[PDB]
Amino acid sequence: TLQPEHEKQIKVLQEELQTIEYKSCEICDNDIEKFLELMLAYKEATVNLMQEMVKSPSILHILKEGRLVAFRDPNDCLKLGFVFKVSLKDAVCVIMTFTKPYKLPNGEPNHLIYFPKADGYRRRNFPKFQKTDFYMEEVPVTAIEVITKRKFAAPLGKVIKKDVAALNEFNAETNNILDGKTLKEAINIEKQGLKIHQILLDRTNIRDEIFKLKSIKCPNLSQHIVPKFKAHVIKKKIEELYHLMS
Ligand SMILES: [Zn+2]
C-alpha cells in the first residue's frame, strides 16, 4: 500500500475503538449521546465566548485580581483558581491554582462540564474538590469555563510572599469555598460587544435543552460519559486519518 503508516494507525484506532466496554444504565441508555454532543456544543460555545471576550479590554474588569475561576489543564481536568495577571497580546492568564486536577475514583480525568447554579448536577458529578498548596500556572483564556461572582479581596502579592496575615485569609477563604460550594456564574456582557450576547443566548439554549434530558439526573453519569467520550475522540481521529470529510 502507498500509505502503510496511515493504515497501521487507523487499524490501531479502530481496534482500540471496538475494545471499549459500555456499562448499561436504566437512565442513560435512552438519551446520553445527545447529552454528549450538546455538552461539546456548550464547551465550544464557551470557547468562542472567551475568544470574543478577550478582544474587549473590559475583560480586565471581569478577571480583576482575585477572581475565582474554573479552568482546564492540557489533560482536560477541571481546576479552581484565582486570577493574578492577564495578557491581552498573548491571550493568556496567570492563575493561582489552589486545587488538584479533578479526577474520578478511577483515576481518569472528569470530562463533565461544570454547570453554575446547578445544586443537583453538582452534588451528583462534582461532590468536592481537593485543596493543594497554591502554585502559579499560566493558562490560555479559552480554557476558562466558569467565571464565579466571588472575588478574593486581599492582594495575591502578599500571598506569594507567604505572609501569615495573607495566608490566613487565603486559607480561610479557600476552605470556605471547598467546604460548601454553590458556584454562580454572572457576566456583565451588557457593557460592550454584540456577538457576545448571541453566544450567551445560544449557550443558554443548549443548556436549557441539555437539562431536559434524562441522563442529566443520573447519579453516576460522571463515569458513564467516559466510554462515549473516548469513543468520540477515537472516532474523530479515525475520520481525520482517513482523509475523509474533505
Ligand atoms: Zn447512568
Domain ranges of the chain: 1-55+189-246, 56-188
In angstroms, what is the span from residue 12 Cα to ligand 1's centroid? Answer: 29
Resolution in Å, one decimal, please.
3.2
Domain 1-55+189-246 carries which CATH code? 1.20.1500.20
Give the span between the Cα atoms of 99 and 79, in whole angstroms.
6
- Which single residue is written with the C-alpha cell 461532590? 127
In angstroms, what is the span from residue 40 Cα to ligand 1's centroid? Answer: 18
Torsional sign, CA 178, 179, 184, 188: negative
Cβ neighbors of 104 (< 8 A, separation 6 or more) are 110, 222, 223, 226
In angstroms, what is the span from residue 23 Cα to ligand 1's centroid? Answer: 9
For this PDB entry, the determination method is X-ray
3-state secondary structure of 134: strand
In angstroms, what is the span from residue 52 Cα to ligand 1's centroid? Answer: 35
In angstroms, what is the span from residue 214 Cα to ligand 1's centroid? Answer: 9
Give the span between the Cα atoms of 212 and 30, in whole angstroms.
13
Domain 56-188 carries which CATH code? 2.30.30.1160
- What is the DSSP code string of 4-63? HHHHHHHHHHHHHHHT------TTTSSSSHHHHHHHHHHHHHHHHHHHHHTTSTTHHHHS
In angstroms, what is the span from residue 116 Cα to ligand 1's centroid? Answer: 21
Cell numbers at residue 72, please? 482546564
Give the span between the Cα atoms of 234 and 227, in whole angstroms.
11
In angstroms, what is the span from residue 218 Cα to ligand 1's centroid? Answer: 5
Contacts 24+ apart (CB under 8 A), 99-103: 99/129, 99/130, 99/131, 99/132, 99/178, 100/129, 100/130, 100/131, 100/132, 101/73, 101/75, 101/77, 102/77, 102/78, 102/126, 102/129, 102/130, 103/77
In angstroms, what is the span from residue 225 Cα to ligand 1's centroid? Answer: 8
In angstroms, what is the span from residue 215 Cα to ligand 1's centroid? Answer: 6
In angstroms, what is the span from residue 75 Cα to ligand 1's centroid? Answer: 24
